[PDB]
Design a protein around this ligand. Sequence first.
Ligand code: UDP
Length: 465
Amino acid sequence: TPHVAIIPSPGMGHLIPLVEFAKRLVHLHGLTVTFVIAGEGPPSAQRTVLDSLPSSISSVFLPPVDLTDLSSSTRIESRISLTVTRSNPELRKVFDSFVEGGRLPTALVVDLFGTDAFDVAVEFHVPPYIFYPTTANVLSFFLHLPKLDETVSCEFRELTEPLMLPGCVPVAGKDFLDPAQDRKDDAYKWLLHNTKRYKEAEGILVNTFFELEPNAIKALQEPGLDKPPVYPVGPLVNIGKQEESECLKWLDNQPLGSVLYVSFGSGGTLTCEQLNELALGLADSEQRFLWVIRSPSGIANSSYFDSHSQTDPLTFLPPGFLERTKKRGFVIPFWAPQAQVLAHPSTGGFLTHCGWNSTLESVVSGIPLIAWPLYAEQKMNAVLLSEDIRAALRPRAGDDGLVRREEVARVVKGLMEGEEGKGVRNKMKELKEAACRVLKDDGTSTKALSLVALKWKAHKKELEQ
Ligand SMILES: O=c1ccn([C@@H]2O[C@H](COP(=O)(O)OP(=O)(O)O)[C@@H](O)[C@H]2O)c(=O)[nH]1
């Protein structure tokens, strides 16, 4: 059977969907999968995700890459991209051992920043594929970026008209994903470099689905200059049926649909001032909430690589906040069993950083959103979710960028109980239905993944014969 090697670039938001993808490949398509894990140190969260997999899935952990030459100011996308790039020598060794074992992969699947691993795929005559863990809208942006880079000579924030790619929500230059915001920085150089390599992929599998981004998917699937086949295969998520304990026990004690979940992904934190206003506004709202909290930082993605929290986040909360909210709020530091929370009947809303896994998980459970983007492509996702899909409400930030407690309370109440939240709640109901539809045996996302697996089985067949 085809053996598929999956090489994630660092990030829980890459590993998680890739694990869901691997499980589908083994359980639904009878393939074997090996994760080849590049990084700087042992896995953290990561082990919980890689644990308990079918034996048709193995993991190889490469020697840690030397990124000691990088300045502490290095942007995450540089670090993420270079972790895969500098790992190529160790990846070659792993491929040699696959060859010796009679298990040369039928495909090498990288994620959105891992395209330099294509060098190893090409060297071993293994078809390269990209598993793209965020939206068809942002994928369109990535595929266009080589052209945009060529045709536009200002920093993107200076553009006076929004970018409006076929089928895509318009996005202002100033809202393009974080690594696009400073074209002199290595983060842009690595972003650009990756995007230039997308045309080398034999296929791009994208974690989204037709009803969610119909216009962008249609556009992506139209023949184009140097454009690879694009396969929507989502929503590939943890549906939250696995057996942290205390916060779920708390949740069990709350009324149906009553709890606002609040979480900023695996790597997001707020400034001090924003943490303070959010706490105060959550309390003001008088809504029930379950907040996964991290210590504040001036850098929104400062926790991206962190295995744990050195400081106690609770020490940053305002006077009396924990007292006032003792019954109606549950504050959990650093990590929650999010898939379980979003699938829980007592959950009714999600204040999200708009990371795409969090978004998909929320869609699959019909949970409406407040869109609170922080970094990476989250602002692009927030524009898509609020202006096009219309499944998120957005808080108003002041001219200093601060969302004040009054706005927090207003939007929370709007989502949980108010008229403004009925539109988004209804839209999420429709998307929840659609999420089921597309993953049925003859659902569009299932069809797309099946086409890829079939291509891999055929390739293996031809090679071995
Ligand atoms: O406390 C948390 C925070 C995050 N997650 C999971 O981590 C992933 C976060 O990925 P996402 O794309 O939403 O954002 P990222 O972490 O990449 O910014 C999602 O699967 C979440 O369910 C979790 O289990 N517990």
